[PDB]
Amino acid sequence: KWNKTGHAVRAIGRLSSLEGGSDVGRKLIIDQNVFIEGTLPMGVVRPLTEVEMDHYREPFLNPVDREPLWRFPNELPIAGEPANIVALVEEYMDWLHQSPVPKLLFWGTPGVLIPPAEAARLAKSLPNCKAVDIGPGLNLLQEDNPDLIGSEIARWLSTLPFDPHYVEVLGERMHYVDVGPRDGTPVLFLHGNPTSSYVWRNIIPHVAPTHRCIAPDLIGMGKSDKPDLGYFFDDHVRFMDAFIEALGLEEVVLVIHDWGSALGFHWAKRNPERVKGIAFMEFIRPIPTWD
Ligand SMILES: [Cl-]
């Protein structure tokens, strides 16, 4: 039941329109900020300080800037809808099952998007994949066990409060973290909903002394510009594509989470020769039924 309310509140905007025929869900997300005040804390086992909540609250203080919080759950591949997202996601999960790229899967109990039984079955079926039990965790595993994730990523790469940096992307300014050495293969950290590069703040220090760490804020989120868009998945794809190109990235290691995993997997499927490794957690894959 309680595990179900978590998924229910995250999808309160979709279910209100679809099966309840009502707009209360959009009202709760846009006006009451339920995604920030509800879904986000219910995605972490440990309690969050008010300083931490304020960092997560900061990009969405104005309700007009909360469009991505509402559109993202409407894009989740659930029950075959939306059809274009499901086909997109099914396509990159087919590529992942075939790709020999080194993989590293973080998971927790009981998780949110990935139940423990799903993380284990997928870890066995994916080639060159290593699974890491972070212990207790829901959606934001980085906030429950950042030391293990940061340490395990650093070890995995060996076998292969930051200053703000900005780049203009398709007419918009996108903020990103950039630390570590200037040479070698960079590591790209893609956050999801409703977070920013802030969610990687305790993992990057573990990876910084040996590898470049690039952690951008998605358009409309974090310290990035927030134009008047619908913020569909296609919008995020266009901006992340141009972000990778604007930074001159050739080969890359991907560290992705939540909707950032959909972005990373969709980019990797279209640029497979440039992907040197994928570390992922609480990722986007098709959900057969609501049940
Ligand atoms: Cl979502």
mmCIF file with all atom_site columns, all heavy atoms in Angstrom, residues 105-108 114-126 129 131-132 283:
data_model
loop_
_atom_site.group_PDB
_atom_site.id
_atom_site.type_symbol
_atom_site.label_atom_id
_atom_site.label_alt_id
_atom_site.label_comp_id
_atom_site.label_asym_id
_atom_site.label_entity_id
_atom_site.label_seq_id
_atom_site.pdbx_PDB_ins_code
_atom_site.Cartn_x
_atom_site.Cartn_y
_atom_site.Cartn_z
_atom_site.occupancy
_atom_site.B_iso_or_equiv
_atom_site.pdbx_formal_charge
_atom_site.auth_seq_id
_atom_site.auth_comp_id
_atom_site.auth_asym_id
_atom_site.auth_atom_id
_atom_site.pdbx_PDB_model_num
ATOM 1   N N   . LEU A 1 105 ? 25.211 -1.419  -12.366 1.00 0.00 ? 105 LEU A N   1
ATOM 2   C CA  . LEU A 1 105 ? 23.825 -1.173  -11.974 1.00 0.00 ? 105 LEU A CA  1
ATOM 3   C C   . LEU A 1 105 ? 23.762 -1.029  -10.457 1.00 0.00 ? 105 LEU A C   1
ATOM 4   O O   . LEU A 1 105 ? 24.015 -1.991  -9.723  1.00 0.00 ? 105 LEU A O   1
ATOM 5   C CB  . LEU A 1 105 ? 22.920 -2.303  -12.474 1.00 0.00 ? 105 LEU A CB  1
ATOM 6   C CG  . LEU A 1 105 ? 21.384 -2.267  -12.357 1.00 0.00 ? 105 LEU A CG  1
ATOM 7   C CD1 . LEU A 1 105 ? 20.797 -3.415  -13.159 1.00 0.00 ? 105 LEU A CD1 1
ATOM 8   C CD2 . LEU A 1 105 ? 20.860 -2.337  -10.923 1.00 0.00 ? 105 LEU A CD2 1
ATOM 9   N N   . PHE A 1 106 ? 23.414 0.166   -9.990  1.00 0.00 ? 106 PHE A N   1
ATOM 10  C CA  . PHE A 1 106 ? 23.123 0.383   -8.580  1.00 0.00 ? 106 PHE A CA  1
ATOM 11  C C   . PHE A 1 106 ? 21.638 0.171   -8.324  1.00 0.00 ? 106 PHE A C   1
ATOM 12  O O   . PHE A 1 106 ? 20.793 0.576   -9.127  1.00 0.00 ? 106 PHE A O   1
ATOM 13  C CB  . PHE A 1 106 ? 23.530 1.791   -8.143  1.00 0.00 ? 106 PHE A CB  1
ATOM 14  C CG  . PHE A 1 106 ? 25.012 2.012   -8.117  1.00 0.00 ? 106 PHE A CG  1
ATOM 15  C CD1 . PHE A 1 106 ? 25.643 2.678   -9.153  1.00 0.00 ? 106 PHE A CD1 1
ATOM 16  C CD2 . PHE A 1 106 ? 25.773 1.560   -7.052  1.00 0.00 ? 106 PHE A CD2 1
ATOM 17  C CE1 . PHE A 1 106 ? 27.008 2.886   -9.130  1.00 0.00 ? 106 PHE A CE1 1
ATOM 18  C CE2 . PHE A 1 106 ? 27.138 1.762   -7.023  1.00 0.00 ? 106 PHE A CE2 1
ATOM 19  C CZ  . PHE A 1 106 ? 27.757 2.426   -8.064  1.00 0.00 ? 106 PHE A CZ  1
ATOM 20  N N   . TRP A 1 107 ? 21.324 -0.467  -7.199  1.00 0.00 ? 107 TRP A N   1
ATOM 21  C CA  . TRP A 1 107 ? 19.938 -0.725  -6.840  1.00 0.00 ? 107 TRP A CA  1
ATOM 22  C C   . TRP A 1 107 ? 19.792 -0.704  -5.327  1.00 0.00 ? 107 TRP A C   1
ATOM 23  O O   . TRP A 1 107 ? 20.766 -0.860  -4.586  1.00 0.00 ? 107 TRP A O   1
ATOM 24  C CB  . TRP A 1 107 ? 19.448 -2.063  -7.406  1.00 0.00 ? 107 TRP A CB  1
ATOM 25  C CG  . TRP A 1 107 ? 20.219 -3.255  -6.920  1.00 0.00 ? 107 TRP A CG  1
ATOM 26  C CD1 . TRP A 1 107 ? 21.387 -3.742  -7.432  1.00 0.00 ? 107 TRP A CD1 1
ATOM 27  C CD2 . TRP A 1 107 ? 19.869 -4.116  -5.829  1.00 0.00 ? 107 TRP A CD2 1
ATOM 28  N NE1 . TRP A 1 107 ? 21.788 -4.850  -6.725  1.00 0.00 ? 107 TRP A NE1 1
ATOM 29  C CE2 . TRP A 1 107 ? 20.873 -5.101  -5.736  1.00 0.00 ? 107 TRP A CE2 1
ATOM 30  C CE3 . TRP A 1 107 ? 18.806 -4.149  -4.922  1.00 0.00 ? 107 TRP A CE3 1
ATOM 31  C CZ2 . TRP A 1 107 ? 20.845 -6.107  -4.773  1.00 0.00 ? 107 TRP A CZ2 1
ATOM 32  C CZ3 . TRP A 1 107 ? 18.780 -5.149  -3.965  1.00 0.00 ? 107 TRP A CZ3 1
ATOM 33  C CH2 . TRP A 1 107 ? 19.794 -6.113  -3.898  1.00 0.00 ? 107 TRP A CH2 1
ATOM 34  N N   . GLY A 1 108 ? 18.551 -0.511  -4.878  1.00 0.00 ? 108 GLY A N   1
ATOM 35  C CA  . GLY A 1 108 ? 18.241 -0.477  -3.464  1.00 0.00 ? 108 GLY A CA  1
ATOM 36  C C   . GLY A 1 108 ? 16.949 -1.217  -3.173  1.00 0.00 ? 108 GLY A C   1
ATOM 37  O O   . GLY A 1 108 ? 16.267 -1.697  -4.081  1.00 0.00 ? 108 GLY A O   1
ATOM 38  N N   . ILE A 1 114 ? 12.637 0.607   -10.043 1.00 0.00 ? 114 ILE A N   1
ATOM 39  C CA  . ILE A 1 114 ? 13.224 -0.721  -10.197 1.00 0.00 ? 114 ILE A CA  1
ATOM 40  C C   . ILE A 1 114 ? 13.091 -1.478  -8.880  1.00 0.00 ? 114 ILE A C   1
ATOM 41  O O   . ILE A 1 114 ? 13.802 -1.165  -7.914  1.00 0.00 ? 114 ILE A O   1
ATOM 42  C CB  . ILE A 1 114 ? 14.696 -0.639  -10.630 1.00 0.00 ? 114 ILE A CB  1
ATOM 43  C CG1 . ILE A 1 114 ? 14.864 0.306   -11.824 1.00 0.00 ? 114 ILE A CG1 1
ATOM 44  C CG2 . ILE A 1 114 ? 15.231 -2.026  -10.959 1.00 0.00 ? 114 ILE A CG2 1
ATOM 45  C CD1 . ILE A 1 114 ? 14.100 -0.121  -13.057 1.00 0.00 ? 114 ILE A CD1 1
ATOM 46  N N   . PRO A 1 115 ? 12.209 -2.467  -8.788  1.00 0.00 ? 115 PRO A N   1
ATOM 47  C CA  . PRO A 1 115 ? 12.187 -3.329  -7.604  1.00 0.00 ? 115 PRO A CA  1
ATOM 48  C C   . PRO A 1 115 ? 13.426 -4.203  -7.558  1.00 0.00 ? 115 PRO A C   1
ATOM 49  O O   . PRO A 1 115 ? 14.044 -4.461  -8.601  1.00 0.00 ? 115 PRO A O   1
ATOM 50  C CB  . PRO A 1 115 ? 10.912 -4.166  -7.793  1.00 0.00 ? 115 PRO A CB  1
ATOM 51  C CG  . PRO A 1 115 ? 10.653 -4.152  -9.257  1.00 0.00 ? 115 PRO A CG  1
ATOM 52  C CD  . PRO A 1 115 ? 11.217 -2.868  -9.801  1.00 0.00 ? 115 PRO A CD  1
ATOM 53  N N   . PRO A 1 116 ? 13.828 -4.666  -6.370  1.00 0.00 ? 116 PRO A N   1
ATOM 54  C CA  . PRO A 1 116 ? 15.059 -5.470  -6.279  1.00 0.00 ? 116 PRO A CA  1
ATOM 55  C C   . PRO A 1 116 ? 15.074 -6.675  -7.206  1.00 0.00 ? 116 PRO A C   1
ATOM 56  O O   . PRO A 1 116 ? 16.126 -7.010  -7.765  1.00 0.00 ? 116 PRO A O   1
ATOM 57  C CB  . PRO A 1 116 ? 15.093 -5.891  -4.802  1.00 0.00 ? 116 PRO A CB  1
ATOM 58  C CG  . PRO A 1 116 ? 14.304 -4.849  -4.090  1.00 0.00 ? 116 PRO A CG  1
ATOM 59  C CD  . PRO A 1 116 ? 13.242 -4.384  -5.048  1.00 0.00 ? 116 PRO A CD  1
ATOM 60  N N   . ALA A 1 117 ? 13.925 -7.329  -7.397  1.00 0.00 ? 117 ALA A N   1
ATOM 61  C CA  . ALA A 1 117 ? 13.871 -8.485  -8.285  1.00 0.00 ? 117 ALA A CA  1
ATOM 62  C C   . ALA A 1 117 ? 14.126 -8.095  -9.734  1.00 0.00 ? 117 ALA A C   1
ATOM 63  O O   . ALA A 1 117 ? 14.666 -8.896  -10.506 1.00 0.00 ? 117 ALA A O   1
ATOM 64  C CB  . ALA A 1 117 ? 12.520 -9.188  -8.152  1.00 0.00 ? 117 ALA A CB  1
ATOM 65  N N   . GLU A 1 118 ? 13.749 -6.875  -10.122 1.00 0.00 ? 118 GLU A N   1
ATOM 66  C CA  . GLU A 1 118 ? 13.997 -6.420  -11.487 1.00 0.00 ? 118 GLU A CA  1
ATOM 67  C C   . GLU A 1 118 ? 15.468 -6.091  -11.709 1.00 0.00 ? 118 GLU A C   1
ATOM 68  O O   . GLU A 1 118 ? 16.024 -6.404  -12.767 1.00 0.00 ? 118 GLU A O   1
ATOM 69  C CB  . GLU A 1 118 ? 13.126 -5.203  -11.796 1.00 0.00 ? 118 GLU A CB  1
ATOM 70  C CG  . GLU A 1 118 ? 11.958 -5.490  -12.721 1.00 0.00 ? 118 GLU A CG  1
ATOM 71  C CD  . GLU A 1 118 ? 12.402 -5.846  -14.124 1.00 0.00 ? 118 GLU A CD  1
ATOM 72  O OE1 . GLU A 1 118 ? 12.631 -4.919  -14.929 1.00 0.00 ? 118 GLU A OE1 1
ATOM 73  O OE2 . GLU A 1 118 ? 12.520 -7.052  -14.423 1.00 0.00 ? 118 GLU A OE2 1
ATOM 74  N N   . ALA A 1 119 ? 16.110 -5.460  -10.723 1.00 0.00 ? 119 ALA A N   1
ATOM 75  C CA  . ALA A 1 119 ? 17.522 -5.119  -10.859 1.00 0.00 ? 119 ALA A CA  1
ATOM 76  C C   . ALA A 1 119 ? 18.392 -6.363  -10.966 1.00 0.00 ? 119 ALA A C   1
ATOM 77  O O   . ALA A 1 119 ? 19.413 -6.348  -11.664 1.00 0.00 ? 119 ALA A O   1
ATOM 78  C CB  . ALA A 1 119 ? 17.968 -4.261  -9.679  1.00 0.00 ? 119 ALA A CB  1
ATOM 79  N N   . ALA A 1 120 ? 18.008 -7.445  -10.287 1.00 0.00 ? 120 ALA A N   1
ATOM 80  C CA  . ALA A 1 120 ? 18.785 -8.678  -10.336 1.00 0.00 ? 120 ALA A CA  1
ATOM 81  C C   . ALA A 1 120 ? 18.609 -9.399  -11.667 1.00 0.00 ? 120 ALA A C   1
ATOM 82  O O   . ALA A 1 120 ? 19.589 -9.846  -12.272 1.00 0.00 ? 120 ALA A O   1
ATOM 83  C CB  . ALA A 1 120 ? 18.389 -9.591  -9.174  1.00 0.00 ? 120 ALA A CB  1
ATOM 84  N N   . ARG A 1 121 ? 17.365 -9.517  -12.140 1.00 0.00 ? 121 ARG A N   1
ATOM 85  C CA  . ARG A 1 121 ? 17.116 -10.199 -13.407 1.00 0.00 ? 121 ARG A CA  1
ATOM 86  C C   . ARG A 1 121 ? 17.762 -9.457  -14.569 1.00 0.00 ? 121 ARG A C   1
ATOM 87  O O   . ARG A 1 121 ? 18.329 -10.079 -15.475 1.00 0.00 ? 121 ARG A O   1
ATOM 88  C CB  . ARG A 1 121 ? 15.612 -10.350 -13.636 1.00 0.00 ? 121 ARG A CB  1
ATOM 89  C CG  . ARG A 1 121 ? 15.246 -11.030 -14.948 1.00 0.00 ? 121 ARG A CG  1
ATOM 90  C CD  . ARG A 1 121 ? 13.997 -10.415 -15.560 1.00 0.00 ? 121 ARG A CD  1
ATOM 91  N NE  . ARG A 1 121 ? 14.260 -9.101  -16.135 1.00 0.00 ? 121 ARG A NE  1
ATOM 92  C CZ  . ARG A 1 121 ? 13.482 -8.506  -17.030 1.00 0.00 ? 121 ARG A CZ  1
ATOM 93  N NH1 . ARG A 1 121 ? 12.379 -9.083  -17.478 1.00 0.00 ? 121 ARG A NH1 1
ATOM 94  N NH2 . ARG A 1 121 ? 13.820 -7.304  -17.487 1.00 0.00 ? 121 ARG A NH2 1
ATOM 95  N N   . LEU A 1 122 ? 17.687 -8.124  -14.561 1.00 0.00 ? 122 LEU A N   1
ATOM 96  C CA  . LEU A 1 122 ? 18.300 -7.347  -15.633 1.00 0.00 ? 122 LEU A CA  1
ATOM 97  C C   . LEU A 1 122 ? 19.820 -7.410  -15.561 1.00 0.00 ? 122 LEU A C   1
ATOM 98  O O   . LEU A 1 122 ? 20.493 -7.438  -16.598 1.00 0.00 ? 122 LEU A O   1
ATOM 99  C CB  . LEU A 1 122 ? 17.812 -5.900  -15.573 1.00 0.00 ? 122 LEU A CB  1
ATOM 100 C CG  . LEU A 1 122 ? 16.710 -5.552  -16.576 1.00 0.00 ? 122 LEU A CG  1
ATOM 101 C CD1 . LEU A 1 122 ? 15.926 -4.334  -16.124 1.00 0.00 ? 122 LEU A CD1 1
ATOM 102 C CD2 . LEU A 1 122 ? 17.298 -5.330  -17.964 1.00 0.00 ? 122 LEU A CD2 1
ATOM 103 N N   . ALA A 1 123 ? 20.379 -7.446  -14.349 1.00 0.00 ? 123 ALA A N   1
ATOM 104 C CA  . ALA A 1 123 ? 21.830 -7.521  -14.207 1.00 0.00 ? 123 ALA A CA  1
ATOM 105 C C   . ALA A 1 123 ? 22.380 -8.806  -14.812 1.00 0.00 ? 123 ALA A C   1
ATOM 106 O O   . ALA A 1 123 ? 23.477 -8.813  -15.383 1.00 0.00 ? 123 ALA A O   1
ATOM 107 C CB  . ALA A 1 123 ? 22.221 -7.413  -12.734 1.00 0.00 ? 123 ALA A CB  1
ATOM 108 N N   . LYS A 1 124 ? 21.631 -9.905  -14.702 1.00 0.00 ? 124 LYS A N   1
ATOM 109 C CA  . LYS A 1 124 ? 22.093 -11.172 -15.256 1.00 0.00 ? 124 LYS A CA  1
ATOM 110 C C   . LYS A 1 124 ? 21.936 -11.216 -16.771 1.00 0.00 ? 124 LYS A C   1
ATOM 111 O O   . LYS A 1 124 ? 22.777 -11.797 -17.468 1.00 0.00 ? 124 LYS A O   1
ATOM 112 C CB  . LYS A 1 124 ? 21.336 -12.334 -14.611 1.00 0.00 ? 124 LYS A CB  1
ATOM 113 C CG  . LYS A 1 124 ? 21.841 -13.702 -15.030 1.00 0.00 ? 124 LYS A CG  1
ATOM 114 C CD  . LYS A 1 124 ? 21.167 -14.807 -14.240 1.00 0.00 ? 124 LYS A CD  1
ATOM 115 C CE  . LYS A 1 124 ? 21.847 -16.141 -14.483 1.00 0.00 ? 124 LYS A CE  1
ATOM 116 N NZ  . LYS A 1 124 ? 23.202 -16.176 -13.876 1.00 0.00 ? 124 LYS A NZ  1
ATOM 117 N N   . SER A 1 125 ? 20.872 -10.608 -17.300 1.00 0.00 ? 125 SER A N   1
ATOM 118 C CA  . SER A 1 125 ? 20.599 -10.671 -18.730 1.00 0.00 ? 125 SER A CA  1
ATOM 119 C C   . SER A 1 125 ? 21.420 -9.674  -19.539 1.00 0.00 ? 125 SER A C   1
ATOM 120 O O   . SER A 1 125 ? 21.560 -9.854  -20.754 1.00 0.00 ? 125 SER A O   1
ATOM 121 C CB  . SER A 1 125 ? 19.108 -10.437 -18.991 1.00 0.00 ? 125 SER A CB  1
ATOM 122 O OG  . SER A 1 125 ? 18.726 -9.117  -18.645 1.00 0.00 ? 125 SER A OG  1
ATOM 123 N N   . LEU A 1 126 ? 21.959 -8.631  -18.904 1.00 0.00 ? 126 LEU A N   1
ATOM 124 C CA  . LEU A 1 126 ? 22.763 -7.656  -19.636 1.00 0.00 ? 126 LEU A CA  1
ATOM 125 C C   . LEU A 1 126 ? 24.220 -8.099  -19.673 1.00 0.00 ? 126 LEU A C   1
ATOM 126 O O   . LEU A 1 126 ? 24.766 -8.495  -18.636 1.00 0.00 ? 126 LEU A O   1
ATOM 127 C CB  . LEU A 1 126 ? 22.665 -6.277  -18.998 1.00 0.00 ? 126 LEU A CB  1
ATOM 128 C CG  . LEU A 1 126 ? 21.296 -5.593  -18.989 1.00 0.00 ? 126 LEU A CG  1
ATOM 129 C CD1 . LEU A 1 126 ? 21.355 -4.305  -18.182 1.00 0.00 ? 126 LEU A CD1 1
ATOM 130 C CD2 . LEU A 1 126 ? 20.813 -5.325  -20.404 1.00 0.00 ? 126 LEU A CD2 1
ATOM 131 N N   . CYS A 1 129 ? 27.806 -6.689  -17.050 1.00 0.00 ? 129 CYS A N   1
ATOM 132 C CA  . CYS A 1 129 ? 27.073 -5.884  -16.082 1.00 0.00 ? 129 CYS A CA  1
ATOM 133 C C   . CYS A 1 129 ? 27.410 -6.335  -14.668 1.00 0.00 ? 129 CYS A C   1
ATOM 134 O O   . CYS A 1 129 ? 27.443 -7.538  -14.385 1.00 0.00 ? 129 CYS A O   1
ATOM 135 C CB  . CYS A 1 129 ? 25.564 -5.976  -16.322 1.00 0.00 ? 129 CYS A CB  1
ATOM 136 S SG  . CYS A 1 129 ? 24.575 -4.917  -15.243 1.00 0.00 ? 129 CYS A SG  1
ATOM 137 N N   . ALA A 1 131 ? 26.266 -5.586  -10.637 1.00 0.00 ? 131 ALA A N   1
ATOM 138 C CA  . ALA A 1 131 ? 25.225 -5.016  -9.794  1.00 0.00 ? 131 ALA A CA  1
ATOM 139 C C   . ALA A 1 131 ? 25.773 -4.726  -8.404  1.00 0.00 ? 131 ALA A C   1
ATOM 140 O O   . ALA A 1 131 ? 26.586 -5.490  -7.874  1.00 0.00 ? 131 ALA A O   1
ATOM 141 C CB  . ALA A 1 131 ? 24.023 -5.958  -9.700  1.00 0.00 ? 131 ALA A CB  1
ATOM 142 N N   . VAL A 1 132 ? 25.324 -3.619  -7.816  1.00 0.00 ? 132 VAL A N   1
ATOM 143 C CA  . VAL A 1 132 ? 25.809 -3.156  -6.520  1.00 0.00 ? 132 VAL A CA  1
ATOM 144 C C   . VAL A 1 132 ? 24.606 -2.851  -5.640  1.00 0.00 ? 132 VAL A C   1
ATOM 145 O O   . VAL A 1 132 ? 23.831 -1.930  -5.933  1.00 0.00 ? 132 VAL A O   1
ATOM 146 C CB  . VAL A 1 132 ? 26.715 -1.924  -6.645  1.00 0.00 ? 132 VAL A CB  1
ATOM 147 C CG1 . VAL A 1 132 ? 27.091 -1.403  -5.265  1.00 0.00 ? 132 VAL A CG1 1
ATOM 148 C CG2 . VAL A 1 132 ? 27.956 -2.267  -7.447  1.00 0.00 ? 132 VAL A CG2 1
ATOM 149 N N   . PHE A 1 283 ? 16.232 3.392   -13.235 1.00 0.00 ? 283 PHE A N   1
ATOM 150 C CA  . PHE A 1 283 ? 16.192 3.847   -14.615 1.00 0.00 ? 283 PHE A CA  1
ATOM 151 C C   . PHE A 1 283 ? 14.808 3.662   -15.228 1.00 0.00 ? 283 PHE A C   1
ATOM 152 O O   . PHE A 1 283 ? 13.894 3.089   -14.628 1.00 0.00 ? 283 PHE A O   1
ATOM 153 C CB  . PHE A 1 283 ? 17.252 3.110   -15.441 1.00 0.00 ? 283 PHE A CB  1
ATOM 154 C CG  . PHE A 1 283 ? 17.143 1.616   -15.374 1.00 0.00 ? 283 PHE A CG  1
ATOM 155 C CD1 . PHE A 1 283 ? 16.503 0.913   -16.379 1.00 0.00 ? 283 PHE A CD1 1
ATOM 156 C CD2 . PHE A 1 283 ? 17.681 0.914   -14.308 1.00 0.00 ? 283 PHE A CD2 1
ATOM 157 C CE1 . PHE A 1 283 ? 16.399 -0.461  -16.320 1.00 0.00 ? 283 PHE A CE1 1
ATOM 158 C CE2 . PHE A 1 283 ? 17.579 -0.459  -14.244 1.00 0.00 ? 283 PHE A CE2 1
ATOM 159 C CZ  . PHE A 1 283 ? 16.938 -1.146  -15.252 1.00 0.00 ? 283 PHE A CZ  1
#
